[PDB]
């Protein structure tokens, strides 16, 4: 028994509709300033951004903005260096348990594939992040819990992380809770499928090529099968 | 193989060259009538079963929900 | 056109040459045309 998030009119919902890359950039900013404290985008590395919403040198900037340790040194373990374009996003709580502790038993789930891993993810995400409503009568959430009608059980350890104007969008687009939830849902989506755009272009070329090739192959088949389909049989007993 | 497949007699068989005949003779001219002829010939033997399927499907889903529904008298 | 059959379709070799050459250029045209479409459909959303 769970609330089933509704269908939202996403800009990538259509059959050939790509992602809005400004929204992916804003959602990456939302993840960097809010979501990165507990969740780990393990499978997304700074380099990945180049080509989507940040240019090579631009990405380098972001990369240079983090300290990543280099374990093997002549005699030492870690002089975290300026993270590079080859470095993956920095996971908070190096060990899972660490977070468990920090989040009161909860383990923020790595949001790299969250949208893909959650049924109706994009919607779910938006709903969960925006579904922090009032608990009803009779409910008795355990210590360190909050109430979201969507989350399985309606008892997500995650406290509501998006308060209106939680962070300021560099683009200046008003940082309303929603504008922030929609941006981070687009970004997480991108994260779970960096190739969304490239694919849809392949699908458009595939539809054009099949629309060219199916009637022509049908015409060749009907040529080579007309002979028989016109064959007239006659029985002429002597 | 061919030549030893079967024995027929006095069955003449005329035919035409592919390039000599129209590719889609009366394609939609008779195709539609025929497709329609065909469906009415098996529709009564194909659809009926699946119709009932849609029905069981629906009834099943609704019934389940009702089961989940809280019993009014429950707790009251 | 009966020039086609005589120049392109008639000899298998010629029938081929035309296919290969056409295909060589078709890609250029198809990709270009297709890209124009894709982009426009989502003109607003793309890096640039």
């Amino acid at each position: 028994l769970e609330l089933h998030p509704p269908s939202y009119p996403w800009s990538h919902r259509g059959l050939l509709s790509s992602l809005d890359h400004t929204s992916i950039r804003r959602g990456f900013q939302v993840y960097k300033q809010v979501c990165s404290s507990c969740h780990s985008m393990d499978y997304v590395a700074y380099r990945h951004l180049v080509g989507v919403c940040y240019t090579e040198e631009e990405a380098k900037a972001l990369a240079e903005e983090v300290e990543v340790q280099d374990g093997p040194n002549d005699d030492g373990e870690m002089f975290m260096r300026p993270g590079k374009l080859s470095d993956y996003f920095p996971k908070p709580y190096p060990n899972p348990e660490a977070a468990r502790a920090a989040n009161n038993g909860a383990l923020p789930p790595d949001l790299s594939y969250i949208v893909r891993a959650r049924h109706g993810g994009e919607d779910y995400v938006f709903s969960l992040l925006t579904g922090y409503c009032e608990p009803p009568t009779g409910v008795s959430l355990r210590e360190g819990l909050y109430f979201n009608p969507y989350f399985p059980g309606q008892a997500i350890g995650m406290a509501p992380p998006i308060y209106t104007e939680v962070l300021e969008y560099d683009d200046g687009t008003p940082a309303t809770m929603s504008q922030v939830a929609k941006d981070v849902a687009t970004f997480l989506r991108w994260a779970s499928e960096p190739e969304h755009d490239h694919r849809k272009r392949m699908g458009l070329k595939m539809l054009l090529m099949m629309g060219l090739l199916l009637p022509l192959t049908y015409a060749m088949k009907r040529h080579k099968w007309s002979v028989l389909k016109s064959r007239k049989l006659a029985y002429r007993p002597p | 193989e061919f030549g030893n497949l079967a024995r027929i007699r006095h069955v003449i068989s005329y035919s035409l060259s592919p390039f000599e005949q129209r590719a889609f003779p009366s394609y939609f001219s008779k195709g539609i009538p025929n497709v329609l002829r065909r469906t009415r010939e098996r529709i009564l033997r194909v659809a009926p079963p699946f119709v009932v399927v849609y029905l069981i499907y629906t009834w099943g889903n609704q019934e389940f929900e009702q089961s989940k529904r809280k019993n009014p008298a429950m707790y009251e | 056109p009966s020039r086609l059959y005589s120049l392109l379709f008639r000899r298998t070799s010629t029938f081929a040459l035309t296919i290969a050459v056409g295909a060589l250029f078709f890609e250029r045209a198809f990709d270009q045309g297709a890209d124009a479409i894709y982009e426009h459909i989502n003109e607003g959303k793309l890096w640039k």
Partner: peptide, 22 residues
């Protein structure tokens, strides 16, 4: 014999100098 009947009509099939094009 073999001349009693003539090749059946294929007019609804047959198309309407042209071979080269065809």
């Amino acid at each position: 014999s073999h001349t009693d009947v003539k090749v059946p009509d294929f007019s609804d099939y047959r198309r309407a100098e042209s071979s080269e094009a065809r």
